Scaffold this motif. Structure first.
Motif, PDB file in Angstrom:
ATOM      1  N   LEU A  44       3.907   1.332   8.938  1.00  0.00           N
ATOM      2  CA  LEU A  44       4.553   1.511   7.650  1.00  0.00           C
ATOM      3  C   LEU A  44       6.066   1.627   7.825  1.00  0.00           C
ATOM      4  O   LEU A  44       6.535   2.062   8.880  1.00  0.00           O
ATOM      5  CB  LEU A  44       4.036   2.768   6.944  1.00  0.00           C
ATOM      6  CG  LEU A  44       2.525   2.819   6.722  1.00  0.00           C
ATOM      7  CD1 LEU A  44       2.094   4.214   6.322  1.00  0.00           C
ATOM      8  CD2 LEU A  44       2.103   1.804   5.678  1.00  0.00           C
ATOM      9  N   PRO A  45       6.860   1.257   6.822  1.00  0.00           N
ATOM     10  CA  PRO A  45       8.313   1.395   6.954  1.00  0.00           C
ATOM     11  C   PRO A  45       8.733   2.856   6.930  1.00  0.00           C
ATOM     12  O   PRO A  45       7.957   3.758   6.614  1.00  0.00           O
ATOM     13  CB  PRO A  45       8.857   0.637   5.745  1.00  0.00           C
ATOM     14  CG  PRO A  45       7.764   0.678   4.761  1.00  0.00           C
ATOM     15  CD  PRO A  45       6.502   0.621   5.544  1.00  0.00           C
ATOM     16  N   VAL A  62      10.776   5.908   5.456  1.00  0.00           N
ATOM     17  CA  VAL A  62      11.353   6.431   4.221  1.00  0.00           C
ATOM     18  C   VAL A  62      12.430   7.445   4.562  1.00  0.00           C
ATOM     19  O   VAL A  62      12.216   8.350   5.378  1.00  0.00           O
ATOM     20  CB  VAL A  62      10.279   7.048   3.304  1.00  0.00           C
ATOM     21  CG1 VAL A  62       9.390   5.961   2.749  1.00  0.00           C
ATOM     22  CG2 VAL A  62       9.438   8.104   4.012  1.00  0.00           C
ATOM     23  N   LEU A  69      15.106   9.897  -0.351  1.00  0.00           N
ATOM     24  CA  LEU A  69      14.250   9.323  -1.379  1.00  0.00           C
ATOM     25  C   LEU A  69      13.127  10.254  -1.809  1.00  0.00           C
ATOM     26  O   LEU A  69      12.505  10.001  -2.845  1.00  0.00           O
ATOM     27  CB  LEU A  69      13.653   8.006  -0.893  1.00  0.00           C
ATOM     28  CG  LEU A  69      14.642   6.936  -0.439  1.00  0.00           C
ATOM     29  CD1 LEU A  69      13.898   5.713   0.056  1.00  0.00           C
ATOM     30  CD2 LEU A  69      15.584   6.557  -1.556  1.00  0.00           C
ATOM     31  N   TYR A  70      12.847  11.308  -1.053  1.00  0.00           N
ATOM     32  CA  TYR A  70      11.805  12.232  -1.453  1.00  0.00           C
ATOM     33  C   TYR A  70      12.234  13.026  -2.689  1.00  0.00           C
ATOM     34  O   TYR A  70      13.430  13.191  -2.942  1.00  0.00           O
ATOM     35  CB  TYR A  70      11.467  13.194  -0.322  1.00  0.00           C
ATOM     36  CG  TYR A  70      10.582  12.596   0.743  1.00  0.00           C
ATOM     37  CD1 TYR A  70       9.273  13.025   0.905  1.00  0.00           C
ATOM     38  CD2 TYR A  70      11.060  11.621   1.602  1.00  0.00           C
ATOM     39  CE1 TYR A  70       8.462  12.487   1.878  1.00  0.00           C
ATOM     40  CE2 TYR A  70      10.255  11.077   2.583  1.00  0.00           C
ATOM     41  CZ  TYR A  70       8.956  11.516   2.715  1.00  0.00           C
ATOM     42  OH  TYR A  70       8.144  10.983   3.685  1.00  0.00           O
ATOM     43  N   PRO A  71      11.284  13.524  -3.482  1.00  0.00           N
ATOM     44  CA  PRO A  71      11.658  14.393  -4.601  1.00  0.00           C
ATOM     45  C   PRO A  71      12.234  15.716  -4.127  1.00  0.00           C
ATOM     46  O   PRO A  71      11.848  16.255  -3.088  1.00  0.00           O
ATOM     47  CB  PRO A  71      10.335  14.615  -5.340  1.00  0.00           C
ATOM     48  CG  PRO A  71       9.479  13.498  -4.932  1.00  0.00           C
ATOM     49  CD  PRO A  71       9.845  13.213  -3.520  1.00  0.00           C
ATOM     50  N   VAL A 101       3.205  -2.472   1.917  1.00  0.00           N
ATOM     51  CA  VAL A 101       2.944  -1.279   1.120  1.00  0.00           C
ATOM     52  C   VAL A 101       4.128  -0.324   1.216  1.00  0.00           C
ATOM     53  O   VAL A 101       4.662  -0.076   2.302  1.00  0.00           O
ATOM     54  CB  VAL A 101       1.642  -0.604   1.575  1.00  0.00           C
ATOM     55  CG1 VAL A 101       1.395   0.693   0.805  1.00  0.00           C
ATOM     56  CG2 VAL A 101       0.474  -1.560   1.403  1.00  0.00           C
ATOM     57  N   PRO A 127       5.252   3.408   1.075  1.00  0.00           N
ATOM     58  CA  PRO A 127       4.700   4.776   1.077  1.00  0.00           C
ATOM     59  C   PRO A 127       5.307   5.670   0.013  1.00  0.00           C
ATOM     60  O   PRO A 127       4.745   6.734  -0.293  1.00  0.00           O
ATOM     61  CB  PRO A 127       5.037   5.297   2.480  1.00  0.00           C
ATOM     62  CG  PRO A 127       5.435   4.119   3.265  1.00  0.00           C
ATOM     63  CD  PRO A 127       6.026   3.157   2.300  1.00  0.00           C
ATOM     64  N   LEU A 128       6.440   5.269  -0.562  1.00  0.00           N
ATOM     65  CA  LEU A 128       7.050   6.048  -1.625  1.00  0.00           C
ATOM     66  C   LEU A 128       6.133   6.157  -2.827  1.00  0.00           C
ATOM     67  O   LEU A 128       6.158   7.170  -3.533  1.00  0.00           O
ATOM     68  CB  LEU A 128       8.374   5.411  -2.032  1.00  0.00           C
ATOM     69  CG  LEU A 128       9.356   6.279  -2.813  1.00  0.00           C
ATOM     70  CD1 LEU A 128       9.861   7.429  -1.967  1.00  0.00           C
ATOM     71  CD2 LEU A 128      10.509   5.433  -3.309  1.00  0.00           C
ATOM     72  N   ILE A 161       3.890   8.879  -2.157  1.00  0.00           N
ATOM     73  CA  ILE A 161       4.580  10.162  -2.139  1.00  0.00           C
ATOM     74  C   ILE A 161       4.808  10.651  -3.559  1.00  0.00           C
ATOM     75  O   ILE A 161       4.541  11.813  -3.884  1.00  0.00           O
ATOM     76  CB  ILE A 161       5.902  10.048  -1.361  1.00  0.00           C
ATOM     77  CG1 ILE A 161       5.628   9.917   0.131  1.00  0.00           C
ATOM     78  CG2 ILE A 161       6.775  11.270  -1.591  1.00  0.00           C
ATOM     79  CD1 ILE A 161       6.683   9.135   0.859  1.00  0.00           C
ATOM     80  N   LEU A 162       5.305   9.773  -4.425  1.00  0.00           N
ATOM     81  CA  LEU A 162       5.482  10.141  -5.821  1.00  0.00           C
ATOM     82  C   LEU A 162       4.143  10.434  -6.477  1.00  0.00           C
ATOM     83  O   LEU A 162       4.060  11.291  -7.362  1.00  0.00           O
ATOM     84  CB  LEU A 162       6.214   9.034  -6.574  1.00  0.00           C
ATOM     85  CG  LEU A 162       7.602   8.667  -6.047  1.00  0.00           C
ATOM     86  CD1 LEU A 162       8.106   7.420  -6.740  1.00  0.00           C
ATOM     87  CD2 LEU A 162       8.577   9.811  -6.236  1.00  0.00           C
ATOM     88  N   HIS A 221       3.277  13.817  -5.550  1.00  0.00           N
ATOM     89  CA  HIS A 221       4.176  14.732  -6.244  1.00  0.00           C
ATOM     90  C   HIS A 221       3.718  14.960  -7.674  1.00  0.00           C
ATOM     91  O   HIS A 221       3.713  16.096  -8.161  1.00  0.00           O
ATOM     92  CB  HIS A 221       5.599  14.185  -6.222  1.00  0.00           C
ATOM     93  CG  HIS A 221       6.608  15.119  -6.810  1.00  0.00           C
ATOM     94  ND1 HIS A 221       6.725  16.432  -6.410  1.00  0.00           N
ATOM     95  CD2 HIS A 221       7.541  14.933  -7.773  1.00  0.00           C
ATOM     96  CE1 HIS A 221       7.691  17.014  -7.099  1.00  0.00           C
ATOM     97  NE2 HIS A 221       8.203  16.125  -7.932  1.00  0.00           N
TER      98      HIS A 221
END
Ligand SMILES: CCCCCCCCCCCCCCCCCC(=O)OC[C@H](COP(=O)([O-])OCC(O)COP(=O)([O-])OC[C@@H](COC(=O)CCCCCCCCCCCCCCCCC)OC(=O)CCCCCCCCCCCCCCCCC)OC(=O)CCCCCCCCCCCCCCCCC
Ligand SMILES: CCCCCCCCCCCCCCCCCC(=O)OC[C@H](COP(=O)([O-])OCC(O)COP(=O)([O-])OC[C@@H](COC(=O)CCCCCCCCCCCCCCCCC)OC(=O)CCCCCCCCCCCCCCCCC)OC(=O)CCCCCCCCCCCCCCCCC
Ligand SMILES: CCCCCCCCCCCCCCCCCC(=O)OC[C@H](COP(=O)([O-])OCC(O)COP(=O)([O-])OC[C@@H](COC(=O)CCCCCCCCCCCCCCCCC)OC(=O)CCCCCCCCCCCCCCCCC)OC(=O)CCCCCCCCCCCCCCCCC
Ligand SMILES: CCCCCCCCCCCCCCCCCC(=O)OC[C@H](COP(=O)([O-])OCC(O)COP(=O)([O-])OC[C@@H](COC(=O)CCCCCCCCCCCCCCCCC)OC(=O)CCCCCCCCCCCCCCCCC)OC(=O)CCCCCCCCCCCCCCCCC
Ligand SMILES: CCCCCCCCCCCCCCCCCC(=O)OC[C@H](COP(=O)([O-])OCC(O)COP(=O)([O-])OC[C@@H](COC(=O)CCCCCCCCCCCCCCCCC)OC(=O)CCCCCCCCCCCCCCCCC)OC(=O)CCCCCCCCCCCCCCCCC
Ligand SMILES: CCCCCCCCCCCCCCCC(=O)OC[C@H](COP(=O)(O)O)OC(=O)CCCCCCCCCCCCCCC
Ligand SMILES: CCCCCCCCCCCCO[C@@H]1O[C@H](CO)[C@@H](O[C@H]2O[C@H](CO)[C@@H](O)[C@H](O)[C@H]2O)[C@H](O)[C@H]1O
Ligand SMILES: COCCOCCOCCOc1ccc(C(C)(C)CC(C)(C)C)cc1
Ligand SMILES: COCCOCCOCCOc1ccc(C(C)(C)CC(C)(C)C)cc1
Lengths: 68, 486, 56, 114, 97, 52, 65
Positions: free
Chosen positions: B462-463, B465, B469-471, F17, F19-20, F23-24, F27
């Motif tokens: 996976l790339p 992050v 970019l996380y909340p 894909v 992953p954000l 993640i959201l 959340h």
């Protein structure tokens, strides 16, 4: 008698073999490529006949003289 | 030459040597006076074969959180310890004879073999940097790759047994950690932490007056809360024992501690009664503590750390991997058991942790200078002097290895470190060409430690992050943001 | 191939230079760079639109 | 303890005998010979011999050799040397006194030791 | 701009002759002269016939007298000794102990 | 066994894909709805703050 | 600015590949010199003892005799 791995030469993966070099523009040089440079003797055969005669004769002369 | 150049200063060096010995003696007296009343007793333990001692940082590397000492003073302490190690060839004439002077000549030839007194510099930081740039980076740069290979081949095993020894879930992380010199991409420390999946679950058994209890995050949180509340000991011990019996009941419902069903470890049952001693159906004999009521459950103050390192343990490393790790960390390695080299490695590890604590007390990395940070990273063995990185990259590198060494595992530490020592040489002069992009720059914000990362599935990577970019990232990174903007 | 016969013909000549065959090499670098190009153009158009909105 | 290993096809034996038969077939392929100039003395019954029809293969390989076909024959005159010297020795006249005093490899000779 | 000591094409052409040998190219090409002029066929026959010949000579005539005689009569007596040994009248005409 | 003499990089490519999204999604699954509407209020008040 | 993870060669990088090849093919070269020497050593050899020999060849290694 022996497993297929031993027969095929690899357990899991067949490894690539580097091919043989060719040296473009000239003859191959190997233990079996030497007759290209060294043929059978063909130039001094008649000299061979003459020298064998003279060698036999001179040896026989000196041997007979020594024995006598 | 350097022989006569160092012989010229050999008279002026003995006074400095003795002064340094006096400073070392005073500092060790102070440190041991603090250690003998604040630090616990890490008992000596023998390996699986029970012939030589084994060492782990979780038990033996203690950090004096509250050490009234300057960071430069601790650097002086460690550097003078290494100078005491380097002074050993002075014993050669006193054991071999008057002809044991040629070893001393070989010692005096190279300046890297020598202690601080033979150096023209004055500051400990500049002196250490000179020694590194002259001798130490070169010696490490020729051990790094072969140590990386030994670690690889220790995981994957020898003679084509990878299908029997490696795991298929740590595969992509393994590739990213060991083959990033092919891609040129940066690495994530969490992917190096994924290597602990080869091991089992590291446990901590607290010993009580009845039974041992496995420590958990909940119990640890409660104990930290009680310790922070600063209550009377009559209430502190009561709350501790309440949490202890609660956790005991919790694990008894779970099915006992994790150690019961682990190969190599185990809790014995009640002892059996043999023959006529068997009283009918009662084939067992419970211990004395069974008479004690469970409400009187009290912590004995004794602890047992169990790393459960089935593939990572330093015992199973071998004669070669330990020596190469000590070469790579510039420690003594020759003509000694792996137990003694293990202890040397654990002492270095403890030094680095104490230095991290003192830096955090002194205000983190940003309070340091550029040369001081360079020397720190050289001590951590993540930088080579032929790189010339930026300050943000240096700080991020330090943060990475600091978090990684907080986990107390030398194998993953060495796996991380060796990735920064894979340099090549080109056969041509024109190639490699002069680059067009600027140097690689980073920041402390780019390091993701506050977030979990699942192991990438094999052949499905996976790339990466960014943490930003996380909340709520502006909230989570607010400490680092204030430290950087200030 | 002949009537009642099949044969294999080999040439007899010294090869002075190697024979070249165009086997195209698969590589992901050009598509990497084209992806970078497209993403950069997206961000540039985005910045232009945002500047146009903020100023106009 | 309960590793649950799948079968590995590389550990089987299904290629050794086929490969040996391939080598032997490559060997026997060089025994192919034309009809012209063919002659083989059969047995008195008229049935073929054993070693007879497998000489052409050996000599076709000798044809392909380079050094052995010009060297390994130089030990053959020595056979005729023995054939001649043996016949000379079967009836060689010798001195009785020397034969009684120095018999060659005779038993109970104290000069030898036994 | 190669920074290494580039090796010429002719030097590689010559080294290929030495490193392109095969096992049979060594075994048979060196074993044929060895087997022919070795301890099996020629040298062995010579050097093991000499022992029996000179044993017979030293038993029958003597080494000093044999050295004093002429090369021709020496060779004749050696040939007679060789015939006696090849015959092996005492071993039942068998070269076994 | 002949894996070396092939090129299956196209048969096996890295997935696209993000992953954000996961993640959201985690959340939103952890947060309640009134906080989502609060975040819409934070955005609106931030818009008025940038306006003034 | 140069590319990373690149450097000039050093003495501890060992010899080049062509030099390693030149090291490898030296046994193959000495083969051609030693197998004829083996055959000559066998062919030009003489036995050391006979039934008539009053003496045997002695070789004092350290000259002690
Ligand atoms: C005959 C025995 C072999 C017959 C078949 C084998 C064969 O000929 O293969 C060719 C074989 C190899 O071919 P080549 O290259 O011509 O050999 C060189 C000749 O030997 C070089 O010798 P040449 O044949 O050219 O002439 C030498 C000459 C020498 O003349 C003399 O002085 C001898 C006088 C005798 C009285 O002898 C004769 O020509 C006839 C006299 C009898 C011998 O040659 C021979 O073996 C025939 C000659 C061998 C004679 C000594 C053998 C011991
Ligand atoms: C010539 C006669 C000269 C006599 C001189 C007497 C006076 C001079 C010196 C006085 C002695 C002073 C005391 C002393 O030196 O204690 C040393 C030493 C350590 O004493 P310690 O301080 O009380 O150790 C406590 C803990 O071990 C401490 O734990 P640690 O973590 O600090 O380090 C432990 C490390 C020791 O750390 C070191 O001492 C470093 C040594 C290097 C520096 C020197 O390991 C050991 O404890 C060694 C135990 C030996 C048994 C282990 C298995 C060895 C296997 C050997 C290889 C395989 C053998 C062949 C296999 C094939 C056959 C099946 O004690 C010894 O056991 C010495 C044994 C030396 C002989 C070992 C030879 C093994 C191979 C024998 C093959 C079979 C033939 C024999 C039948
Ligand atoms: C000279 C320099 C001396 C300075 C000390 C040498 C270097 C330091 C060292 O060796 O550590 C000591 C070594 C500790 O080894 P380690 O670093 O802890 O490695 C253990 C790892 O778990 C093992 O990890 P690993 O798997 O990576 O390493 C494996 C390595 C481990 O092996 C080693 O540790 C070798 C270490 C090098 C030792 C240097 C020896 C040089 C000899 C020249 C005072 C001594 C008085 C007694 C003397 C007489 C014994 O190799 C072996 O396992 C095989 C060792 C045995 C090889 C020789 C076997 C001969 C077999 C003959 C046939 C027997 C047939 C009869 C069978 C009967 C029926 C059963 O402990 C000792 O050997 C005893 C300590 C005190 C004496 C040491 C020196 C003499 C004994 C050796
Ligand atoms: C028993 C062992 C128990 C404790 C083992 C620990 C230990 O000994 O450390 C040595 C230690 C090894 O280094 P290290 O502890 O691993 O730390 C390296 C540093 O991190 C720096 O690492 P580096 O990468 O920068 O390398 C520094 C460099 C430069 O190292 C230097 O510091 C200067 C070079 C000093 C050479 C001293 C050896 C002289 C040998 C005799 C020559 C003939 C003398 C005159 C004619 C007589 O190292 C070398 O080039 C060679 C060092 C090893 C030389 C051999 C030492 C023999 C130790 C005796 C036990 C082993 C045999 C059993 O040697 C030294 O570096 C300092 C000199 C040690 C003097 C000790 C005097 C007692 C000698 C007893 C003789 C026993 C002979 C028995 C067989 C006959
Ligand atoms: C033959 C081929 C050469 C022989 C070399 C063998 C070396 C022996 C040795 O060093 O032992 C230490 C070595 C353990 O030493 P270590 O603690 O691992 O440290 C390695 C050296 O410090 C690593 O060496 P280093 O990096 O410290 O370099 C310095 C060293 C290197 O220099 C030299 O040793 C020789 C100088 C000339 C060559 C230089 C070329 C460059 O010179 C020295 O100053 C110390 C050597 C004394 O012992 C073994 O590994 C055992 C192997 C020998 C025993 C095997 C079985 C023997 C037969 C047993 C019969 C009875 C069985 C029943
Ligand atoms: C003594 C040297 C042997 C001379 C052999 C002549 C030759 O070039 O060799 C040529 C001859 C045979 O030549 P042909 O190709 O004509 O059959 O031998 C060989 O083919 C290989 C000889 C290997 C031994 C080399 C020494
Ligand atoms: C038959 C009765 C039971 C006994 C069975 C065992 C008999 C063993 C003796 C015969 C040994 C033959 O040994 C044979 O050696 C050759 C090398 O030339 C090996 O050859 C192998 O390696 C080479 C290169 O090293 C590869 O190119 C080749 O593809 C592979 O076959 C054969 O795999 C092995 O079979
Ligand atoms: C390396 O191991 C391979 C060696 O194999 C040798 C096998 O030896 C047997 C070959 O000998 C023969 C036997 C029969 C025949 C032919 C006579 C098959 C019969 C025929 C031609 C009349 C059909 C040919 C050669
Ligand atoms: C039944 O078999 C009898 C034949 O045995 C002959 C013994 O020969 C000794 C070794 O001969 C060789 C030589 C080379 C080889 C090869 C060509 C396979 C060598 C190799 C693997 C290096 C290419 C195999 C055997």
């Amino acid at each position: 008698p022996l497993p297929n791995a031993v027969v095929q030469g690899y357990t899991s993966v067949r490894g690539p073999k580097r091919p043989l070099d060719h040296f473009y523009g000239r003859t191959p040089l190997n233990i079996d490529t030497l007759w290209h440079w060294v043929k059978f003797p063909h130039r001094y055969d008649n000299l061979r006949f003459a020298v064998c005669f003279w060698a036999f004769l001179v040896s026989a002369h000196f041997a007979n003289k020594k024995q006598r | 030459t350097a022989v006569v150049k160092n012989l010229a200063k050999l008279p002026a060096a003995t006074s400095q040597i003795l002064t340094n010995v006096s400073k070392l003696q005073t500092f060790h007296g102070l440190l041991e006076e603090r250690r003998d009343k604040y630090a616990p007793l890490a008992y000596h333990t023998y390996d699986n074969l029970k012939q030589k001692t084994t060492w782990h940082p979780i038990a033996h590397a203690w950090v004096d959180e509250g050490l009234p000492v300057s960071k430069k003073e601790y650097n002086e302490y460690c550097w003078l310890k290494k100078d005491m190690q380097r002074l050993l060839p002075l014993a050669s004439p006193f054991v071999f004879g008057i002809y044991g002077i040629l070893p001393l000549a070989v010692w005096l030839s190279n300046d890297g073999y020598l202690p601080s007194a033979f150096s023209s510099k004055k500051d400990i930081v500049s002196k250490k940097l000179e020694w590194y740039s002259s001798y130490g980076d070169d010696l490490r740069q020729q051990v790094g790759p072969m140590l990386q290979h030994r670690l690889k081949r220790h995981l994957r095993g020898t003679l084509n047994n990878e299908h029997r020894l490696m795991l298929d879930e740590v595969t992509e992380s393994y590739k990213e950690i060991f083959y990033s010199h092919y891609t040129g991409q940066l690495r994530d420390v969490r992917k190096c932490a994924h290597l602990r999946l080869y091991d089992g679950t590291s446990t901590v058994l607290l010993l009580t007056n009845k039974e041992p209890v496995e420590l958990t995050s909940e119990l640890l949180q409660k104990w930290n809360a009680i310790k922070a509340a600063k209550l009377s000991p009559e209430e502190e011990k009561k709350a501790r024992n309440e949490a202890l019996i609660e956790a005991y009941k919790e694990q008894e419902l779970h099915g006992g501690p994790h150690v019961k069903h682990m190969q190599g470890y185990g809790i014995p049952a009640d002892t059996p009664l043999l023959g006529e001693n068997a009283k009918g159906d009662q084939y067992t004999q419970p211990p004395e503590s069974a008479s004690i009521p469970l409400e009187q459950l009290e912590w004995t103050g004794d602890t047992v750390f169990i790393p459960a390192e089935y593939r990572t343990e330093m015992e199973d490393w071998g004669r070669e991997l330990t020596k190469l790790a000590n070469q790579f960390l510039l420690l003594p390695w020759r003509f000694v058991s792996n137990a003694w080299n293990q202890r040397r490695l654990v002492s270095w590890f403890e030094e680095i942790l104490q230095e991290d604590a003192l830096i955090a007390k002194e205000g983190g990395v940003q309070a340091l200078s550029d040369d001081e940070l360079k020397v720190a990273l050289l001590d951590r063995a993540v930088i080579r002097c032929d790189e010339e990185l930026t300050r943000g990259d240096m700080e991020a590198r330090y943060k990475e290895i600091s978090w990684l060494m907080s986990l107390r595992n030398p194998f993953i530490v060495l796996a991380w470190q060796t990735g920064y020592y894979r340099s090549t040489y080109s056969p041509e002069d024109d190639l490699p060409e002069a680059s067009i992009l600027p140097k690689l720059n980073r920041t402390v914000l780019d390091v993701d430690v506050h977030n979990e990362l699942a192991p990438d599935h094999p052949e499905k990577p996976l790339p990466r992050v960014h943490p930003a970019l996380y909340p709520n990232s502006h909230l989570a990174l607010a400490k680092e943001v204030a430290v950087l903007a200030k | 191939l002949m009537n009642g016969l099949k044969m294999r013909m080999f040439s007899l000549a010294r090869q002075q230079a190697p024979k070249i065959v165009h086997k195209p090499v698969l590589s992901p670098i050009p598509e990497h760079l084209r992806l970078v190009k497209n993403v950069a153009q997206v961000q540039i158009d985005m910045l232009k639109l945002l500047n146009a909105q903020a100023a106009k | 303890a309960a590793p649950a290993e799948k079968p590995d096809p590389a550990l089987d034996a299904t290629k050794a005998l086929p490969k040996a038969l391939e080598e032997v077939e490559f060997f026997q392929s060089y025994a192919v010979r034309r009809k012209t100039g063919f002659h083989l003395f059969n047995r008195a019954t008229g049935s073929p011999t054993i070693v007879g029809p497998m000489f052409y293969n050996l000599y076709n390989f000798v044809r392909i050799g380079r050094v052995s076909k010009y060297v390994c024959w130089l030990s053959l005159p020595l056979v005729f040397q023995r054939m001649w010297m043996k016949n000379r020795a079967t009836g060689m006249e010798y001195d009785i006194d020397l034969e009684n005093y120095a018999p060659f490899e005779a038993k109970k000779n104290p000069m030898h030791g036994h | 701009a190669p920074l290494y000591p580039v090796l010429s094409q002719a030097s590689l052409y010559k080294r290929h002759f030495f490193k392109n040998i095969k096992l049979f190219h060594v075994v048979f090409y060196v074993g044929a002269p060895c087997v022919t002029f070795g301890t099996a066929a020629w040298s062995g026959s010579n050097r093991n016939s000499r022992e029996a010949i000179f044993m017979v000579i030293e038993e029958r005539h003597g080494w000093d007298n044999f050295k004093k005689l002429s090369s021709h009569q020496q060779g004749v007596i050696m040939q007679e000794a060789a015939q006696e040994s090849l015959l092996a009248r005492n071993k039942g005409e068998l070269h076994l102990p | 066994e002949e894996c070396m003499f092939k090129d299956t990089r196209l048969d096996v490519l890295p997935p696209q894909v993000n992953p954000l999204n996961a993640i959201l999604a985690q959340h939103t699954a952890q947060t309640p709805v009134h906080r989502s509407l609060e975040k819409r209020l934070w955005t609106e008040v931030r818009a008025t703050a940038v306006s003034e | 600015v140069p590319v990373a993870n690149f450097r000039p060669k050093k003495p501890w990088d060992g010899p080049w590949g062509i030099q390693i090849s030149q090291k490898k093919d030296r046994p193959f070269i000495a083969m051609w010199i030693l197998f004829p020497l083996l055959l000559v050593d066998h062919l030009t050899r003489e036995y050391y003892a006979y039934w008539h020999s009053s003496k045997v060849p002695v070789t004092d290694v350290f000259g002690d005799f």
